[PDB]
């Protein structure tokens, strides 16, 4: 229930959008307009280096907003972020891939064209 | 026929006469100009 910036006419209680979903209900406490946004978005995903190469994995959430790196394509945990860029093999999205490089661990970086 | 049960058939935009006219125009262009009419103005 976020704080909205749009005022309501003084006879309405509900509120919908273009896609016809109730996302703005006026709170009857002191006439506050509050938006509605679902808390659960997308699913989970895993990054695996493969067989005969490693044993650890990196869990990636599709669009959930939070070692831990806040990528553009959700939340990626278990993979450190490095500023340099190489050619990428395992795609994730939004120009960021993951790879197993140098011990050695799973790293995330912006791909090189 | 097949139209008695609401299964109406839409007539085509171009009739067979217009398609024949297009083919005859293409034939005349390809015998009188070769490939110049297909890539610019027609040259005799």
């Amino acid at each position: 229930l976020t704080e909205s910036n749009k005022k309501f006419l003084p006879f309405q209680q509900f509120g919908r959008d273009i896609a016809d979903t109730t996302d703005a209900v006026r709170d009857p406490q002191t006439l506050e307009i509050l938006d509605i946004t679902p808390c659960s978005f997308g699913g989970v995903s895993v990054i695996t280096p493969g067989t005969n190469t490693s044993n650890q994995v990196a869990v990636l959430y599709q669009d959930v907003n939070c070692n831990v790196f806040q990528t553009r394509a959700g939340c990626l945990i278990g993979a450190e972020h490095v500023n340099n860029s190489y050619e990428c093999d395992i795609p994730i999205g939004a120009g960021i891939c993951a790879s197993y490089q140098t011990s050695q661990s799973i790293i995330a970086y912006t791909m090189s064209l | 026929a097949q139209k008695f049960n609401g299964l109406t058939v839409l007539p085509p935009l171009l009739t067979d006469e217009m398609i024949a006219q297009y083919t005859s125009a293409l034939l005349a262009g390809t015998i009188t100009s070769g490939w110049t009419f297909g890539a610019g103005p027609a040259l005799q």
């Binding site: 749009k6 309501f8 006879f11 309405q12 509900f14 509120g15 919908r16 109730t22 | -």
Partner: protein
Amino acid sequence: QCVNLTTRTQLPPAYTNSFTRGVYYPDKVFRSSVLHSTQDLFLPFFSNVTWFHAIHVTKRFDNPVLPFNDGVYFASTEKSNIIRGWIFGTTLDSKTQSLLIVNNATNVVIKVCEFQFCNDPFLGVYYHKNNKSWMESEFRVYSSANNCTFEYVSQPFLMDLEGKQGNFKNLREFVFKNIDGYFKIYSKHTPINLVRDLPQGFSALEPLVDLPIGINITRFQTLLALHRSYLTPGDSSSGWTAGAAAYYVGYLQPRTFLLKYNENGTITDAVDCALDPLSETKCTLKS
């Protein structure tokens, strides 16, 4: 108690045309920047709507018991608050629950009961001699009453009891509906400077009070107020004055309407689907 009138020369009712009128909010939700279509009783656009006169200069006074269909549209270009209120019912013989929504000079009074309704109730305003103010004295709306349950007062509403013959300065529109016995009121005061031929401008109607009565309704009739000055003898037989007023009565029909909600949240246009082929094309594409 009520008295009978005397036969006199009247004027036949006229027919006028609406111009994008009779649009209200069909619900109580908020919609912004969306074109939402709903199936509800509205007033069709460009439809021949009835017209009734209330001017004196002659002696025009017509209050027929019009049938109350599924929703009515009541628009008035009121200037000096000559009209007072509305009454409802089926037979008006103290056998059903007849409504009486009147607006007195102190407070609005809504009470549906079984009033002994006369042939032609009206409000009488008398002009005092020592006091230079118009005051209502003849409260002849019904003979008596027996029993009822609902009564509503709301906030006080102040009006002017002085009637003139000048041009109108305000326009008031009312919509009365009955769905599953639920009484609906929609109104919005709109200033205007005109005498006839209602403007093509757009104005939605917001609900004011929503009455949970759950009764029957098939007929309705409006109430009017006449003045008793020193010019008239003061008897309600042939000499009276009613000022200048005009109210329009329209009947709502079930048509799909495509509403135009802006970023603020108010209706701007009400393009139809069964009036014009162009309007049907507009409302089928939702654009």
